[PDB]
């Protein structure tokens with residue numbers, strides 16, 4: 385499961401959960417589906433080569449399901465855990481057996497941000 | 501997964517800390533972060549089994565918090581009671597319970613609505629050694645709480661900087677300019 | 689009207705109304721300015737004609 | 739220089755000190771208000787401020803309220819209770835959440 | 839009559855709360871596995887649709 389959090393120009397914040405298998409990356413031109421197995425959208429170090437577009441087959445936004453929802457990850461954005469990001473984009477199921485829990489309550493509800 | 505494994509060698513991870521920073525460096529009640537290692541997976545998972553994960557320390561909500569000497573960070577996001585402070589005359593040696601959540605019905609002082617609203621912001625109990633007039637914060641974001649430190653001006657500036665706040669402010673501005681222009685053009 | 693028709697439906701964004709009882713004390717007085725202005729205008733015009 | 743204690747509920751944690759302070763302030767106020775009645779009368783924890791039949795004097799009770807409020811930096815709610823004795827004064831002072 | 843007045847009578851009902859306890863569970867903690875902030879962060883995500891999540 386991947387949780388995507390987005391915001392609008394009016395300050396409304398929408399968080400939606402999507403199963404990993406519903407992702408489908410697009411080519412750099414956005415006019416076709418990029419091969420899931422061999423997809424080149426991450427630089428050598430891990431960042432995005434270009435703004436990556438991915439189509440979700442089914443997205444549940446505000447309790448309403450929609451078909452073929454296209455979303456974008458701007459190149460001007462930090463990418464954490466490039467392996468996990470690539471797996472989510474390609475639709476793989478990530479094995480999280482080797483996991484640790486860090487207790488850091490650094491985020492408050494409705495926390496402010498620069499995305500306004 | 502062959503491609504992902506091949507690229508994992510040169511892939512690099514980045515820190516997951518953002519503008520909000522770390523709460524333990526600004527909140528005395530937030531313990532420093534600690535990593536907990538899960539135990540080995542259970543060979544048999546009984547239907548009525550309980551978690552074996554190591555326990556995490558539980559910190560209950562305090563009734564009130566002391567005065568942070570200019571190093572106050574609210575536990576939650578408080579309601580903006582007002583955009584300018586209250587010029588209140590405080591008595592010498594009298595304990596005051598300044599409201600942190602921002603919904604108090606008794607003014608700057610705590611009224612009890614913190615216990616009825618879902619928030620980790622607790623009233624600040626403080627005392628003053630010299631009676632006189634003080635500017636008590638109303639936006640509830642002052643770092644020198646309960647005392648105002650002109651953070652309301654920066655809050656107003658951020659509201660104006662926001663796309664929707666800019667629209668609201670200037671829509672009201674042009675609404676008043678409507679009256680101004682009607683008065684200016686009244687005679688024709 | 690637009691907000692209610694677009695977001696307040698159960699499908700989109702229902703809100704958990706936890707408020708028990710109302711607490712308004714002078715909202716009626718604040719709102720009655722507009723009908724007050726209506727009455728003032730009516731009285732002024734009627735008296736000027738009379 | 740004596741640094742004030744960090745803990746808040748000192749009066750609650752020290753019932754004896756609070757009772758002694760209450761007795762002192764009430765005695766001083768009574769001697770200033772009605773000397774002829776309280777100059778020769780010691781004030782203890784069991785002392786009450788009613789007549790021999792049980793009727794209370796509102797003037798004396800409000801004087802005690804003012805003395806206690808000035809001493810402890812709190813606001814006594816007269817309409818809710820009346821301080822007719824040292825025991826009631828102690829009860830109200832301990833009930834108050836911010837006495838000092 | 840002698841036996842009735844030689845022993846205590848059955849008690850009558852009393853409606854005083856003796857050491858009352860919270861009807862719900864413990865108050866959510868400031869910090870821990872689940873805090874009041876987690877509850878506070880739920881009002882903004884509320885939907886009742888025609889399909890499961």
Ligand SMILES: CCCCCCCCCCCCCCCCCC(=O)OC[C@H](COP(=O)([O-])OCC(O)COP(=O)([O-])OC[C@@H](COC(=O)CCCCCCCCCCCCCCCCC)OC(=O)CCCCCCCCCCCCCCCCC)OC(=O)CCCCCCCCCCCCCCCCC
Pocket residue numbers: 582583584585652653656
């Ligand atoms: C044709 C036009 C062309 C234009 C071209 C373009 C121009 C570009 C210009 C660019 C710059 C513009 C700047 C605009 C600023 C807008 C933003 C803003 O201010 O908000 C930030 C503001 C931050 O505030 P702050 O600066 O930090 O101050 C907070 C202090 O607590 C505030 O408290 P304080 O410390 O200031 O205390 C005030 C006062 C408190 O005392 C009082 O109670 C006030 C009255 C005292 C008696 C005065 C007698 C004279 C007659 C007074 C009549 C009104 C009194 C009403 C009292 C009601 C009481 C219930 O202090 C006293 O105790 C009394 C002192 C009296 C000394 C006498 C001095 C000489 C006479 C003048 C006195 C003025 C007193 C202030 C009046 C304020 C309004 C009521 O953010 C907010 O919180 C917003 C609150 C809501 C604001 C609504 C109003 C918005 C408009 C304000 C600006 C007005 C500009 C008008 C210009 C018109 C030109 C045509």
Ligand SMILES: CCCCCCCCCCCCCCCCCC(=O)OC[C@H](COP(=O)([O-])OCC(O)COP(=O)([O-])OC[C@@H](COC(=O)CCCCCCCCCCCCCCCCC)OC(=O)CCCCCCCCCCCCCCCCC)OC(=O)CCCCCCCCCCCCCCCCC
Pocket residue numbers: 584585586587588
């Ligand atoms: C023989 C004698 C006969 C005498 C006859 C009678 C005299 C004539 C009639 C007098 C009527 C008086 C009505 C006001 C009652 C005041 C009650 C009072 O004293 O409360 C104690 C109250 C609490 O006392 P306290 O607990 O000891 O605290 C003391 C602290 O210093 C407290 O300081 P603080 O910082 O905590 O707060 C002070 C101030 C500090 O914050 C503020 O200033 C609040 C508002 C501004 C915030 C942002 C600051 C940045 C600058 C903003 C600039 C705004 C410009 C746009 C203003 C609106 C559009 C014009 O905030 C406020 O006061 C809040 C008010 C918010 C609403 C303001 C809306 C005003 C509407 C009317 C405007 C009229 C303009 C006329 C201009 C004429 C010349 C062109 O203290 C005060 O209110 C202090 C001021 C004392 C009263 C000054 C009154 C000045 C004259 C007002 C005339 C109003 C128009 C005429 C109406 C009647 C005739 C039609």
Ligand SMILES: CCCCCCCCCCCCCCCCCC(=O)OC[C@H](COP(=O)([O-])OCC[N+](C)(C)C)OC(=O)CCCCCCCCCCCCCCCCC
Pocket residue numbers: 657660661662663666670674677
């Ligand atoms: C003979 C031919 C003659 C032709 C003459 C033509 C004249 C043309 C005059 C153009 C005037 C332009 C005014 C706006 C300038 C904005 C500058 C800017 O970017 O500021 C950012 C700065 C930065 O503000 P900030 O950073 O604090 O927050 C806003 C930031 N954004 C918007 C990015 C989220 O804004 C300000 O500080 C305010 C500036 C003034 C804003 C005025 C808004 C007017 C709204 C009008 C709405 C439509 C109605 C128009 C008609 C009625 C008008 C009364």
Ligand SMILES: CCCCCCCCCCCCCCCCCC(=O)OC[C@H](COP(=O)([O-])OCC[N+](C)(C)C)OC(=O)CCCCCCCCCCCCCCCCC
Pocket residue numbers: 713714717718720721724725727728731
């Ligand atoms: C100022 C903006 C409008 C400008 C244009 C219209 C002129 C001005 C109108 C002023 C309206 C003021 C009251 C409404 C706004 C709220 C203000 C407020 O605090 O109100 C509560 C105040 C106080 O009422 P209150 O104390 O009962 O308020 C509620 C009290 N608690 C909270 C305890 C329940 O109302 C008034 O003071 C109203 C009476 C004003 C003084 C007496 C003269 C008027 C009497 C009634 C007039 C009837 C109609 C007249 C029609 C014309 C005749 C020629």
Ligand SMILES: CCCCCCCCCCCCCCCCCC(=O)OC[C@H](COP(=O)(O)OCCN)OC(=O)CCCCCCCCCCCCCCCCC
Pocket residue numbers: 684685686687688
């Ligand atoms: C900052 C950079 C840009 C500005 C730089 C300085 C000016 C540069 C040159 C501008 C040239 C174009 C405008 C020239 C004036 C045009 C004629 C005019 O405005 O006449 C008024 C006209 C008719 O109005 P009327 O009802 O007959 O008279 C009312 C009397 N109270 O009015 C109308 O028809 C009503 C139209 C709305 C007018 C609202 C404002 C009043 C008129 C002000 C005119 C002066 C210029 C204003 C420019 C504002 C720019 C933001």
Ligand code: FES
Pocket residue numbers: 598599600601602603604605610611612613614615621622623624
């Ligand atoms: S702190 Fe705002 S009500 Fe207690």
Ligand code: FES
Pocket residue numbers: 582583584585636637638639640641642647648649650651652653
């Ligand atoms: S009112 Fe909060 S800083 Fe001035």
